Design a protein around this nucleic acid. Structure first.
Lengths: 97, 138, 30, 225
RNA sequence: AGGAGUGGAGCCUGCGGCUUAAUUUGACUCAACACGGGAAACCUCACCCGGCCCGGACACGGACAGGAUUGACAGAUUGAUAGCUCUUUCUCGAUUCCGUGGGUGGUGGUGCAUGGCCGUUCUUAGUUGGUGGAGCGAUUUGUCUGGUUAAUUCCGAUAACGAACGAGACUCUGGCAUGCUAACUAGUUACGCGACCGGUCGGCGUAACUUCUUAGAGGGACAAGUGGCGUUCAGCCACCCGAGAUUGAGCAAUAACAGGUCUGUGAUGCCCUUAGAUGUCCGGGGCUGCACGCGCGCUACACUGACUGGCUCAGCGUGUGCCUACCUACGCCGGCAGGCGCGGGUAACCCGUUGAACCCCAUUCGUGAUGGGGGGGGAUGCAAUUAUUCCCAUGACGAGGAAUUCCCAGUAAGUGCGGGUCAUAAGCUUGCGUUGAUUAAGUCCCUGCCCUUUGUACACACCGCCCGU
């Protein structure tokens, strides 16, 4: 869980600005595919993912080398509380019904 | 439109386009009796002394050849020449001596009019070749 | 729970009597 | 810009494999029946169909948007390049997963596996399927893992038509000591082709027609049209 | 009957005890060894180190918030390259710490587990109801003495009749444009030139109204033709014909093996699984270490041929990839690559008429172990090393340890072309050509499976049962 918190809040902010996000699990990569040109250690973010899935707030899923999130009303509400997001933000995935 | 019944031996196909001419024959830009191995020289010689020069003096024949192997090209060139001669000399002039020459052909070698049907056999897994299997370990 | 095939794959095991009794209970229940 | 055919066919195979494994991993609870994918110019789409139409469509659209975002973000798909179409059911030539799910979620809540086998067998042969096989592998009575296979009806295995008379689904049910793994196979009905069963008559059987009765002529009888 | 006929001689990843921690298994005699489609320092070791992060959420104890992985420089220093133990110093900003039970890193514990598909008994021809007949019944007949057939394939007899799966038909594949669907980009006779002055250049011209190799339809062959044999039925043989009078594979029973795969997989038999290390971080020694020790892998093994090239022939294997980057024309230095723009193309366009293989030898080796296989370097990747992957040298074997190996017409072998690792092939393998064959139209012997009758005190079924001291 040993990633400095600035990347944590950045990832949470981009998560809620986009909705769900993807995860590739590997230690041999130099730089993240989507998060390239930043040099973010993958192990720390992986530990953060397994911690939040063990903490019991996003339904933990191990799906064949490629991970996704599980968004729900409870998960979105908890992310809002944890990131202290303003009470005006709505995700772009629910646009126009 | 056209028959052009050609000739095939194994995978090697040779076609003899025959038309009105002087009777001389060419095989792939080349006359006949200069084959490099020159062991099947008489094999290509066969038709000319089988049917006679008196029938090979009024038709220009051009032979095109393609297909692997030294011998495989042969047994098809002569077949192509023979069948082109049958076709041309039948469609125009007469049918009695047509029967004569085709009968001479048949009694010498049936292959000169009708092609060899049998070809290669595909290989199945579990062995080196088609029917042979690998050595069983014991 | 179904007595019909319970009897069909238990009549050789330890539970032959119970499944037979249940199957006969289904057939004539009175 | 130009691309070959074999390589993109294999890439589409990759995409199909991943989407189908993910689908069979999640959607097994909500009664889906038939799922496919389709292509429009510079556009890919996924379509689903079931007896529970709006249930599979989901509530609040959570399933739709969530899984579409998943595929969009995983498979390099540009945003918006995936949508869901609509369809309808022709007939019952593909009726296995409804009863399979029924038995599965009866057993999950407490139910004997073989009672479910009885029920699924009887419903499937009431539906009109030619034959059905259910192989439950594992421990049912005792610690010997016997592959309890239950067959009913006819099953051919030999011939060119035999390529297109099989349907298969897979599931599992839970005991604490071990898992009972249920494969369900169904033979397809030639008679209810529904345009899927071959229109052509069965090869071996020379499909003959009843002759037509008529009066054998004795005196000439002539009609004017 | 016959060809390699193996192993005999140095000649695969795996391989038996295997001395050291290690050169081990996850498969064990038609069910272990090209095994997880391995060109082995690794992802091309699981057995090995230590720095590499210490997965703990969920009731709550500790100053009742600062207990620093993340910061390198000639002395500390289980690599000075780790803040890991020298009196010494440090890079985020709330989240390292210890605990009933959860999490897992699943190559290490079992397979006498199925996530499901495989392999197999088995591709030998077997298997099963219904109604009827026999029997008190378990059961039996149908499913058979006979002939025939590749076939439980038919005919025939017939207390059985009628059906089903399997066999077959069915699909594709060489024979099938001897006529029809018709592109110069692959080929298509006609069209003064070039060549000596009438005959070869594939560099050029009727946009020829496609015979070729490029293929959608359609056609053909059926034991119908004849002769013969047959209880004259099923059928069988020969002959005349025809491209073809049996081409190969594909699909392949019911039921089972106490088979393989959790090493395709986080559902699943599990004491160390309280995140103490198999990889995350390092790759050293070797499955390249030696003795019958199980493994087709062994090209070639000499005057049939080894040399040098005068030489003349379709692989119809295929070869430019959303987070892809690995396929030398035009000129030259060179034994390979190396290139300087530069491999013509996302392909029948570009490799191309893909000149690869026994051959008229283009100096030599006329009978012998010989001309016959035959230790330093210049350069793909982080590292040539027990030459993994080019240059000069110091050249057993006799048709070969006793050898549960395949094969009956384009077939055994030779040889060649490629695809699996692709950083450049594979000592195997998978497809395809070329050269191309001698015995056969038979039989149960010695090998296996199957059937009938028969015996049985066996039923876990002879690896049985069982008697006696």
């Amino acid at each position: 869980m040993l990633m400095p918190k600035k990347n944590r809040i950045a990832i949470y902010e981009l998560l809620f600005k986009e909705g769900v996000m993807v995860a590739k699990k590997d230690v041999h990569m130099p730089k993240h595919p989507e998060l390239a040109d930043k040099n973010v250690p993958n192990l720390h973010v992986m530990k953060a993912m397994q911690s939040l899935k063990s903490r019991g707030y996003v339904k933990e899923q191990f799906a064949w080398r490629h991970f996704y999130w599980y968004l729900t009303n409870e998960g979105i509400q908890y992310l809002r509380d944890y990131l202290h997001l303003p009470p005006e933000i709505v995700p772009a995935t629910l646009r126009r019904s | 439109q056209s028959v052009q019944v050609f000739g095939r031996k194994k995978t090697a196909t040779a076609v003899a386009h025959c038309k009105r001419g002087n009777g001389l024959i060419k095989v792939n830009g080349r006359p006949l009796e200069m084959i490099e191995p020159r062991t099947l020289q008489y094999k290509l010689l066969e038709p000319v002394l089988l049917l006679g020069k008196e029938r090979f003096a009024g038709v220009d024949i051009r032979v095109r050849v393609k297909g692997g192997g030294h011998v495989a090209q042969i047994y098809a060139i002569r077949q192509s020449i023979s069948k082109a001669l049958v076709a041309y000399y039948q469609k125009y002039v007469d049918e009695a001596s047509k029967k004569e020459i085709k009968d001479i052909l048949i009694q010498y070698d049936r292959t000169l009019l009708v092609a060899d049907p049998r070809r290669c056999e595909s290989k199945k897994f579990g062995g080196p070749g088609a029917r042979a299997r690998y050595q069983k370990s014991y | 729970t179904d007595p019909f095939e319970d009897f069909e794959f238990n009549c050789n095991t330890k539970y032959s009597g119970g499944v037979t009794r249940n199957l006969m209970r289904e057939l004539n229940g009175g | 810009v130009q691309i070959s055919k074999k390589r993109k066919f294999v890439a589409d195979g990759i995409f199909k494999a991943e989407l189908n494994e993910f689908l069979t991993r999640e959607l097994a609870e909500d009664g889906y029946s038939g799922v496919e994918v389709r292509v429009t110019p510079t556009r890919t789409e996924i379509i689903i169909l079931a007896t529970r139409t709006q249930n599979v469509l989901g509530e609040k659209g959570r399933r739709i948007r969530e899984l579409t975002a998943v595929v969009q973000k995983r498979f390099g798909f540009p945003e918006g390049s995936v949508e869901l179409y609509a369809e309808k059911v022709a007939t019952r030539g593909l009726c296995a997963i409804a009863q399979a799910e029924s038995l599965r979620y009866k057993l999950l809540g407490g139910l004997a596996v073989r009672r479910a086998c009885y029920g699924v067998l009887r419903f499937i042969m009431e539906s009109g399927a030619k034959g059905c096989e259910v192989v439950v592998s594992g421990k049912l009575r005792g610690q010997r893992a016997k592959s309890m296979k239950f067959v009913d009806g006819l099953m051919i295995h030999s011939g060119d038509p035999v390529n297109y008379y099989v349907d298969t689904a897979v599931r599992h049910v839970l005991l604490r000591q071990g898992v009972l793994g249920i494969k369900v196979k169904i033979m397809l009905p030639w008679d209810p082709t529904g345009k899927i069963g071959p229109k052509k008559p069965l090869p071996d059987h020379v499909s003959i027609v009843e002759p037509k009765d008529e009066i054998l002529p004795t005196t000439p009888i002539s009609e004017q049209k």
